[PDB]
UniProtKB/Swiss-Prot annotation, chain A:
Family indicated by similarity: Belongs to the SAC3 family.
Record lineage: Eukaryota, Metazoa, Chordata, Craniata, Vertebrata
Natural source organism: Homo sapiens (Human)
Disease / disorder: Peripheral neuropathy, autosomal recessive, with or without impaired intellectual development: An autosomal recessive disorder characterized by early childhood-onset of peripheral sensorimotor neuropathy, progressive distal muscle weakness, atrophy in hands and feet, and gait difficulties, often with loss of ambulation. Most affected individuals also have impaired intellectual development, although some have normal cognition. Additional features may include eye movement abnormalities, claw hands, foot deformities, and scoliosis.
Name under which the protein is recorded: Germinal-center associated nuclear protein
Interaction with ENY2 as annotated region, ranges: 1-38, 45-72
Complexes and interactors: Isoform GANP: Component of the nuclear pore complex (NPC)-associated TREX-2 complex (transcription and export complex 2), composed of at least GANP, 2 copies of ENY2, PCID2, SEM1/DSS1, and either centrin CETN2 or centrin CETN3. The TREX-2 complex also associates with ALYREF/ALY. Interacts with RNA polymerase II subunit POLR2A and with the transcription elongation factor SUPT5H/SPT5. Interacts (via FG-repeats) with NXF1; this interaction is not mediated by RNA.
Tissue specificity as recorded in UniProt: Widely expressed. Up-regulated in germinal center B-cells in tonsils (at protein level).
Region listing for CID, in residue ranges: 1-72
Curated annotation (Swiss-Prot), chain B:
HAMAP family to which the protein is assigned, alphabetical: ENY2_Sus1 (MF_03046)
InterPro entries the UniProt entry points to: TF_ENY2 (IPR018783), TF_EnY2_sf (IPR038212)
Keywords, comma-separated and alphabetical: Acetylation, Activator, Chromatin regulator, Isopeptide bond, mRNA transport, Nucleus, Protein transport, Transcription, Transcription regulation, Translocation, Transport, Ubl conjugation
The species this protein was found in: Homo sapiens
Pfam families: EnY2
Physiological role: Involved in mRNA export coupled transcription activation by association with both the TREX-2 and the SAGA complexes. The transcription regulatory histone acetylation (HAT) complex SAGA is a multiprotein complex that activates transcription by remodeling chromatin and mediating histone acetylation and deubiquitination. Within the SAGA complex, participates in a subcomplex that specifically deubiquitinates both histones H2A and H2B. The SAGA complex is recruited to specific gene promoters by activators such as MYC, where it is required for transcription.
Cross-link Glycyl lysine isopeptide (Lys-Gly) (interchain with G-Cter in SUMO2): residue positions: 66
Chief location category: nucleus
Lineage: Eukaryota, Metazoa, Chordata, Craniata, Vertebrata
Protein name: Transcription and mRNA export factor ENY2
Complex formation: Component of the nuclear pore complex (NPC)-associated TREX-2 complex (transcription and export complex 2), composed of at least ENY2, the isoform GANP of the MCM3AP gene, PCID2, SEM1, and either centrin CETN2 or CETN3. TREX-2 contains 2 ENY2 chains. The TREX-2 complex also associates with ALYREF/ALY and with the nucleoporin NUP153. Component of some SAGA transcription coactivator-HAT complexes, at least composed of ATXN7, ATXN7L3, ENY2, GCN5L2, SUPT3H/SPT3, TAF10, TRRAP and USP22.
GO BP annotations listed: chromatin organization; negative regulation of insulin secretion involved in cellular response to glucose stimulus; poly(A)+ mRNA export from nucleus; positive regulation of DNA-templated transcription; protein transport; regulation of DNA repair; regulation of RNA splicing; regulation of transcription by RNA polymerase II
UniProt record similarity statement: Belongs to the ENY2 family.
Length: 72, 91, 93
């Protein structure tokens, strides 16, 4: 014989607070991991672009110097 | 009455019972795979919205409703029983 | 946007440290080793022979040569420069 719904209310609130905090912590960690991984992706990708840029630059110059040496 | 709820909550806290129940609740939710479900849902929302747009507030807003609905009624039944046992022994 | 900023930062770090120059010299050495120079000049001699020395101009020469020049660069040389850049970056913040 449960007289009051006071204990029901306490179980509902406690469950809701614990659940909510767990969702917040989980979402925060999942996004933090994703952003960290993406950061590594972007650094690698940018290194590729820089490398390709430097090569084409040094090359455009070496194609000029080569042309010269052959003449005459 | 809220004054009663405040009195009980204070007791749960100082007796360490609230912290203890919280620990066991979290452990049960992890055990049953509830937390893995949250993470799976996060992955999909991230992929859908994009890291260039999504924030933590966005994720929580999107994931919470389903999270709340997937809390097993079994753990809620056990929790309620623990609360009643606690009230009976401290009042 | 953010990627462009990151490319600029990496670029500037390579210059401040003198790494850009070391990379340039690295590329030069590798292009010799794989015979890039030799293959390119032979291509130049061919085009000169068809066009004729009098008719040909260097800007015109660069036009027919550059496609070949870019194609002669082996991917291994590109990979190696890339690796040194990534390594450099890990040792500089």
């Amino acid at each position: 014989l449960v007289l009051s719904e006071l204990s029901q209310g306490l179980a509902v609130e406690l469950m809701e607070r614990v659940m909510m905090e767990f969702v917040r912590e989980t979402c925060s960690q999942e996004l933090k991991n994703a952003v960290e991984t993406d950061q590594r992706v972007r650094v690698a990708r940018c290194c590729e672009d820089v490398c390709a840029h430097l090569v084409d630059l040094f090359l455009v110059e070496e194609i000029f110097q080569t042309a010269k040496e052959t003449l005459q | 009455d809220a004054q009663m709820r405040a009195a009980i909550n204070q007791k749960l806290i100082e007796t360490g019972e609230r912290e203890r129940l919280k620990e066991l609740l979290r452990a049960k939710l992890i055990e049953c795979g509830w937390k893995d479900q949250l993470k799976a849902h996060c992955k999909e929302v991230i992929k859908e919205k994009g890291l260039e747009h999504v924030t933590v507030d966005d994720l929580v807003a999107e994931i919470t409703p389903k999270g709340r609905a997937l809390v097993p009624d079994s753990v809620k039944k056990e929790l309620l029983q623990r609360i009643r046992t606690f009230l009976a022994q401290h009042a």
